[PDB]
Design a protein around this ligand. Structure first.
Ligand SMILES: Cc1cc2nc3c(=O)[nH]c(=O)nc-3n(C[C@H](O)[C@H](O)[C@H](O)COP(=O)(O)O)c2cc1C
Ligand SMILES: Cc1cc2nc3c(=O)[nH]c(=O)nc-3n(C[C@H](O)[C@H](O)[C@H](O)COP(=O)(O)O)c2cc1C
Lengths: 337, 339
C-alpha cells in the first residue's frame, strides 16, 4: 500500500534524516518521496502492506516531527508512483526556480489552511482520515455508545456578570481540561455546544467514562484553589451526565454542510442527567446501562427514578460534593458583586 | 494594492481552458493586474494582485462565472509591499498536461491536500468559512459579544423513528432534513453552527429578524411538500419539524485548545431557543420565539401571544406557523404507520 501524510516540526539534520531514510528504505524495498516546506513535512511511502506499516509506526513516535495526520491510503495499487526513489528528499525552501514558486506558494497556503481546519474537525473524522477512509462515503452505523455530557454550573450567572475576555479564558480552560482528560482515557469529543461538552465512549470503556468524569471534577477542584479569588477560574464547577444506548454514528448533511453526529435517545438522556446534578448532592449521574458497563468495584449509589417513562439514576460515592449546590450558585452570584 | 488567493471547482474541456487565459491576459494587462492561474484535475488555483477597486470588481465577475463553482478565497493581503508575479498578466499553467517527473510529487501532493481541504470545508461552521473568505485567520480572531437570533430545529418524534426505522432509512431521512434546512438557512443569510443529533443550530443577526421567520416557515413548507411528494413507504413521508428562535446576547468565537477547536455561541439565548423548540410539541404551532425576536421584525406579521412559559419568558408565534394537524395524533400516526 501507499500513504500520504503531513507533519509538523518540534537543517543539516533533515539531510541526515534523508541519508538515513535512503539506506533503510532501499533495504526495505519501500520507495517514495519526502518534502519539507516552512516547517512542515510531506512524505509518500509505498511498499508491501506489512512493510510500510512497520515503518510508519517508527516515524509516528519520532520526536522530531509532531501533529501527524495520514491523508490518504490505497490498499491495492496496480503500480508504484516512484519505482526508483528509495527516499528522494526535497528541501523545497532551498528551491529558487520561479516556475515552481507558484505551485510552491499554493502548496504552502492550502496546507496551512488545511492545518487550521484540522483543529475544528471531530476526532472521529480525523481518525477515519488517518485510516485511509473517505468520511463522505463511509456509511453510518448503529453502535452501543456511552454518551458524555458536561457543562459549567451557573453559567448564566457567569456570563451575566463577567467581561467577555474573562468568560473566554474560563471556558477555554474548561474545554482544555475536559478534552485532555477525555482523550487520555480513550474517549472521543464530538463537539462543543455552548458551555456543554459532548463526548462518547465505547461499551468497553464504562469505567473509563466514570474515571474521566471524576478526573474532570477533581482537576476543576484543584484549579479553584490554585488561583486567587479575583480569578474567574475560582468559580468553575461542572455537572456530568452519562448514558448508554444505541446511537447512529456517522457523517450527515449535504454538499453545503457536513457534520459528525450521533442519533439516538441516549444523547438527550445524558443531557438531562447532566442538568439533574444541580438538584443532587453528587456532580455525576448516569443510567443503569452505564452502571452495568462497569467492571471495577465502584460504590454505586442509587439515586432513584427520574423522568426526562422515568428511568433509574445512579452515581458513585466519590462524586459527592463537599459543598452545597444552591449555596454555591448564591456564592457565585454575590461574589460577582 | 491587493492580492487574493482562491480555489474553485469546475462545473463540467481542455481547449476551452486556453480561452479563459486568452481573455484573462487581455483584461488583466489593461487593468494593470497580474496573477497566476493553475488548473489541476477539475480544480482551479488562481492568484490575483493589483489595486483594490479593480481587483474586487474583477473578482466579483469570476464569482458569477458559469464554468466554475464552490469558489473559496483562502488568503488576502491588503496593501502589499511588492507583487509576486510582476510580469505575468495571467500565466495559465495546466498541470494535468505537464508530465515532468520532477514535479509529479509536488503535483500529486497539491492535488491530495486540496481534495482533503475541500472535504474539511464541508464540516466547518459557516462563520469560519466566512472568516477565511475575508482573509482573516479564524484562530486569531478574538471572540465578540453580539446580539444574535439563535435558530434551533429538530425532527418531530425522532425517538420513535430511530426505534422503528432501519439505520439506512434514518440516515436518508436525516440527510434530507439537514440538506433542506442548510439550503434555506444559507439562502436567507443565516449561518449554520453545527448539527446536534437531529437538531440544526443556526444564527442570524439582529437585522435578519424577518429572514429568521421566513427561514422557519420555508423549512416547514418544504417538509410539507416533500411529505406528499413521496409514497407512504418512504421515511420522508413522516418528516416533521419544530423550530424555536431566541434573541439575546451571545459570545461568538473560536474556543477550545490545541487538542480541539470549535466555533461556539455562549449565552442564555442558545438554551432558550432549544426549550422553545421543544415547546412546539405542546403547541398548535410549529414555530415559537421570544419577544426579542418579535421586536427584531420589520414585516407586518400577525403575532400570536402564547403566554409565559419556562424565570419565565413570554413566547410568541405567527399565524402562518399554524399546524393543519394535531401534534399528539401525528406522534401516534407515526407510530401506527411503522408496524
Ligand atoms: C519526517 C520524518 C520522516 C522520516 N521518514 C523515514 C523513512 O521514510 N524511512 C526511515 O527509515 N526513517 C524515516 N525517518 C526516521 C525515523 O523516525 C526512524 O527514527 C528511523 O528510520 C530509524 O531510527 P532508529 O535507527 O534509531 O531505529 C523519518 C523521520 C522523520 C522526522
Ligand atoms: C477560473 C477562472 C478565472 C478567471 N480569471 C480571469 C481573470 O483573471 N481576468 C479576466 O478578465 N477574466 C477572468 N475569467 C473570466 C471572467 O469571468 C470573464 O470571462 C471576464 O472577466 C469578462 O469577459 P466578458 O466581458 O467578455 O464577458 C476567469 C474565469 C474563470 C472560470
Amino acid at each position: 500500500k501507499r500513504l500520504v501524510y503531513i507533519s509538523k516540526i518540534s537543517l543539516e539534520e533533515i539531510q541526515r534524516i534523508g541519508k538515513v531514510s535512503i539506506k533503510n528504505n532501499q533495504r526495505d524495498n519501500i520507495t517514495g518521496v519526502l518534502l519539507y516546506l516552512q516547517g512542515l513535512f510531506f512524505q509518500i511511502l509505498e511498499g508491501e502492506n506489512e512493510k510500510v506499516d512497520k515503518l510508519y509506526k517508527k516515524i509516528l513516535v519520532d520526536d522530531r516531527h509532531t501533529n501527524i495526520l495520514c491523508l490518504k491510503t490505497e490498499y491495492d495499487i496496480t503500480d508504484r508512483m516512484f519505482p526508483n526513489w528509495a527516499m528522494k528528499t526535497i528541501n523545497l525552501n532551498e528551491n529558487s526556480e520561479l516556475m515552481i514558486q507558484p505551485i510552491k506558494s499554493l502548496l504552502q497556503t492550502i496546507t496551512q489552511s488545511h492545518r487550521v481546519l484540522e483543529k475544528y474537525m471531530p476526532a472521529r473524522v480525523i481518525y477515519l482520515i488517518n485510516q485511509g477512509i473517505n468520511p463522505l462515503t463511509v456509511e453510518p452505523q448503529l453502535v452501543e455508545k456511552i454518551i458524555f455530557f458536561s457543562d459549567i454550573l451557573a453559567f448564566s450567572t457567569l456570563t451575566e456578570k463577567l467581561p467577555v475576555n474573562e468568560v473566554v479564558i474560563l471556558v477555554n480552560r474548561y474545554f482544555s481540561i475536559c478534552t485532555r482528560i477525555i482523550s487520555a482515557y480513550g474517549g472521543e469529543v464530538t463537539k462543543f455546544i455552548g458551555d456543554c461538552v459532548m463526548a462518547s465512549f465505547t461499551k468497553e470503556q464504562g469505567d473509563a467514562a466514570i474515571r474521566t468524569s471524576l478526573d474532570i471534577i477533581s482537576e476543576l477542584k484543584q484549579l479553584r484553589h490554585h488561583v486567587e479569588a479575583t480569578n474567574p477560574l475560582h468559580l468553575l464547577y461542572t455537572g456530568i451526565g452519562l448514558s448508554y444506548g444505541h446511537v447512529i454514528e456517522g457523517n450527515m448533511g449535504s454538499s453545503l454542510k457536513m457534520d459528525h453526529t450521533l442519533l439516538g435517545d441516549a444523547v438527550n438522556v445524558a443531557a438531562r442527567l447532566e442538568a439533574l446534578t444541580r438538584q443532587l448532592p453528587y456532580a455525576l449521574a448516569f443510567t443503569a446501562g452505564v452502571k452495568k458497563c462497569c467492571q471495577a468495584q465502584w460504590t454505586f449509589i442509587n439515586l432513584g427514578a427520574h423522568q426526562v417513562e422515568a428511568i433509574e439514576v445512579y452515581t458513585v460515592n466519590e462524586a459527592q460534593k463537599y459543598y452545597d449546590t444552591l449555596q454555591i450558585t448564591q456564592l457565585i452570584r454575590q461574589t460577582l458583586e
